[PDB]
Motif scaffolding. Structure first.
Motif, mmCIF file in Angstrom:
data_model
loop_
_atom_site.group_PDB
_atom_site.id
_atom_site.type_symbol
_atom_site.label_atom_id
_atom_site.label_comp_id
_atom_site.label_asym_id
_atom_site.label_seq_id
_atom_site.Cartn_x
_atom_site.Cartn_y
_atom_site.Cartn_z
ATOM 1 N N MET A 104 38.130 55.911 37.328
ATOM 2 C CA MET A 104 38.508 57.279 37.773
ATOM 3 C C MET A 104 39.509 57.227 38.922
ATOM 4 O O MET A 104 39.148 57.426 40.081
ATOM 5 C CB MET A 104 37.240 58.017 38.208
ATOM 6 N N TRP A 105 40.771 56.960 38.590
ATOM 7 C CA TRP A 105 41.836 56.879 39.588
ATOM 8 C C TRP A 105 41.401 56.071 40.811
ATOM 9 O O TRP A 105 41.876 56.306 41.922
ATOM 10 C CB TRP A 105 42.264 58.282 40.020
ATOM 11 N N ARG A 106 40.501 55.114 40.596
ATOM 12 C CA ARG A 106 40.003 54.263 41.676
ATOM 13 C C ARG A 106 39.653 55.080 42.919
ATOM 14 O O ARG A 106 39.745 54.587 44.043
ATOM 15 C CB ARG A 106 41.043 53.199 42.031
ATOM 16 N N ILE A 107 39.250 56.330 42.710
ATOM 17 C CA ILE A 107 38.886 57.214 43.813
ATOM 18 C C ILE A 107 39.974 57.236 44.885
ATOM 19 O O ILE A 107 39.687 57.106 46.075
ATOM 20 C CB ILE A 107 37.551 56.786 44.455
ATOM 21 N N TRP A 108 41.224 57.402 44.446
ATOM 22 C CA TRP A 108 42.376 57.442 45.350
ATOM 23 C C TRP A 108 42.185 56.520 46.555
ATOM 24 O O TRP A 108 42.586 56.850 47.670
ATOM 25 C CB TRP A 108 42.623 58.873 45.830
ATOM 26 N N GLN A 109 41.568 55.361 46.310
ATOM 27 C CA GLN A 109 41.308 54.368 47.356
ATOM 28 C C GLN A 109 41.017 55.023 48.705
ATOM 29 O O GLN A 109 41.413 54.513 49.754
ATOM 30 C CB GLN A 109 42.500 53.417 47.489
ATOM 31 N N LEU A 110 40.318 56.153 48.670
ATOM 32 C CA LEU A 110 39.968 56.873 49.889
ATOM 33 C C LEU A 110 38.689 56.309 50.497
ATOM 34 O O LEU A 110 38.713 55.696 51.563
ATOM 35 C CB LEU A 110 39.796 58.364 49.595
ATOM 36 N N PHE A 111 37.574 56.521 49.807
ATOM 37 C CA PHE A 111 36.282 56.031 50.273
ATOM 38 C C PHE A 111 35.451 55.504 49.107
ATOM 39 O O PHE A 111 34.579 56.203 48.589
ATOM 40 C CB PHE A 111 35.522 57.144 50.996
ATOM 41 N N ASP A 112 35.726 54.270 48.698
ATOM 42 C CA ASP A 112 35.000 53.656 47.593
ATOM 43 C C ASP A 112 35.266 52.151 47.520
ATOM 44 O O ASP A 112 34.332 51.352 47.551
ATOM 45 C CB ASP A 112 35.379 54.324 46.269
ATOM 46 N N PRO A 113 36.544 51.740 47.418
ATOM 47 C CA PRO A 113 36.906 50.319 47.339
ATOM 48 C C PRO A 113 36.355 49.514 48.513
ATOM 49 O O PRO A 113 35.598 48.562 48.325
ATOM 50 C CB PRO A 113 38.435 50.331 47.373
ATOM 51 N N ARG A 114 36.741 49.904 49.724
ATOM 52 C CA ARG A 114 36.288 49.217 50.930
ATOM 53 C C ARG A 114 34.765 49.202 51.012
ATOM 54 O O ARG A 114 34.157 48.155 51.234
ATOM 55 C CB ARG A 114 36.872 49.887 52.176
ATOM 56 N N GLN A 115 34.154 50.369 50.829
ATOM 57 C CA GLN A 115 32.701 50.486 50.882
ATOM 58 C C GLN A 115 32.046 49.598 49.830
ATOM 59 O O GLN A 115 30.982 49.026 50.062
ATOM 60 C CB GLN A 115 32.278 51.941 50.671
ATOM 61 N N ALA A 116 32.689 49.489 48.673
ATOM 62 C CA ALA A 116 32.172 48.671 47.583
ATOM 63 C C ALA A 116 32.135 47.200 47.975
ATOM 64 O O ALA A 116 31.134 46.514 47.759
ATOM 65 C CB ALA A 116 33.015 48.865 46.332
ATOM 66 N N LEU A 117 33.227 46.719 48.560
ATOM 67 C CA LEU A 117 33.312 45.328 48.981
ATOM 68 C C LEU A 117 32.337 45.061 50.118
ATOM 69 O O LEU A 117 31.741 43.986 50.202
ATOM 70 C CB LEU A 117 34.738 44.989 49.419
ATOM 71 N N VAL A 118 32.168 46.052 50.983
ATOM 72 C CA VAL A 118 31.250 45.934 52.107
ATOM 73 C C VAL A 118 29.805 45.942 51.620
ATOM 74 O O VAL A 118 28.921 45.373 52.259
ATOM 75 C CB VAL A 118 31.448 47.076 53.121
ATOM 76 N N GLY A 119 29.572 46.586 50.479
ATOM 77 C CA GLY A 119 28.235 46.652 49.921
ATOM 78 C C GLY A 119 27.814 45.341 49.297
ATOM 79 O O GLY A 119 26.730 44.829 49.574
ATOM 80 N N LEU A 120 28.684 44.788 48.459
ATOM 81 C CA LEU A 120 28.405 43.515 47.799
ATOM 82 C C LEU A 120 28.289 42.414 48.833
ATOM 83 O O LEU A 120 27.274 41.721 48.926
ATOM 84 C CB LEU A 120 29.520 43.144 46.818
ATOM 85 N N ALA A 121 29.356 42.261 49.597
ATOM 86 C CA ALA A 121 29.425 41.239 50.637
ATOM 87 C C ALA A 121 28.238 41.327 51.595
ATOM 88 O O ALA A 121 27.595 40.321 51.889
ATOM 89 C CB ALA A 121 30.732 41.359 51.407
ATOM 90 N N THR A 122 27.954 42.530 52.083
ATOM 91 C CA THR A 122 26.845 42.730 53.009
ATOM 92 C C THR A 122 25.502 42.512 52.315
ATOM 93 O O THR A 122 24.570 41.975 52.906
ATOM 94 C CB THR A 122 26.899 44.132 53.616
ATOM 95 N N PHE A 123 25.411 42.940 51.060
ATOM 96 C CA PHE A 123 24.179 42.799 50.288
ATOM 97 C C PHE A 123 23.777 41.333 50.145
ATOM 98 O O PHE A 123 22.646 40.958 50.448
ATOM 99 C CB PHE A 123 24.346 43.430 48.903
#
Length: 52
Positions: free
Chosen positions: A1-20
């Motif tokens: 979905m338009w990669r969520i206009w790289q607003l608030f999703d990509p960074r949070q996603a990487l922070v979620g996996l990495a932090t998890f």
């Protein structure tokens, strides 16, 4: 979905996996290492044997 206009999703996603993973493995090694080394130098049927 338009990669969520790289607003608030990509960074949070990487922070979620990495932090998890980081946190998970951290708690594991930390708890085992902590309890192991703790009770070790602690002494309870292992360190304080008879008399030394």
């Amino acid at each position: 979905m338009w990669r969520i206009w790289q607003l608030f999703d990509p960074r949070q996603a990487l922070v979620g996996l990495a932090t998890f993973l980081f946190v998970l493995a951290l708690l594991i090694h930390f708890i085992l290492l902590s309890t192991e080394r703790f009770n070790w130098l602690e002494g309870a049927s292992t360190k304080p044997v008879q008399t030394s």
